[PDB]
Structure 1
Amino acid sequence: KSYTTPKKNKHKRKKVKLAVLKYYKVDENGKISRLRRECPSVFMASHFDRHYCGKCCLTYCFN
């Protein structure tokens, strides 16, 4: 079982749940403002250029 040096293992992922996640803001105490855009058909996230979903897998980008 001589494992080759340059091949090595391929590490799997490690998630990072960065505490409680925020998607809203408090406007005048009573009312609320939403930060990120939502699905049409659930927040479609802000990719650096794209707008990618996290469930139904829909995608968008304003050129």
Structure 2
Amino acid sequence: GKKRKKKVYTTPKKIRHKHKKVKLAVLNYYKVDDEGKVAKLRKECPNCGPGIFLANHGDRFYCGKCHSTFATQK
């Protein structure tokens, strides 16, 4: 026979890391130059190719696609 009790935890909780959703996120990446040319506020990643934007957190820029291999100090 087995005599098991209700498990009591010495830990408050660990919560699922909810993904940070951002409304109107894409336009912040770019900048319209008055009905015509456009520029990109973020920096492009060389390894992946054109378009993918580097991530700036503090004194470095970081990629998303090849995220692991690219983190270059500013």
Q: Tell me if TM exceeds 0.5.
A: yes
Runs (4+) off by over 2 Å: none
| 1:20 and 2:32 are equivalent in the alignment | no
Question: Given residue 60 of structure 1, which amino acid in structure 2 is its aligned partner?
Answer: T
Q: Which runs of 5+ in 1 are unaligned?
A: none
**What letter is aligned with 2:63?**
C
Which structure shows the bigger proportion of residues in strand conformation?
1
Post-superposition shift, 1:28?
2.8
Q: TM-score under structure 2 normalisation?
A: 0.69
CA distance in structure 2 between the aligned counterparts of 1:17 and 1:10, rounded to whole angstroms: 20
Count of equivalent residues = 61
Matches within 5 A, 1:5-44: 6-21=10-25, 22-41=28-47, 42-44=52-54
Q: Which has the larger radius of gyration?
A: 2
Deviations 1:29-63 (A, max 9, x none): 1111110001001111111222111110211113x
RMSD: 1.5
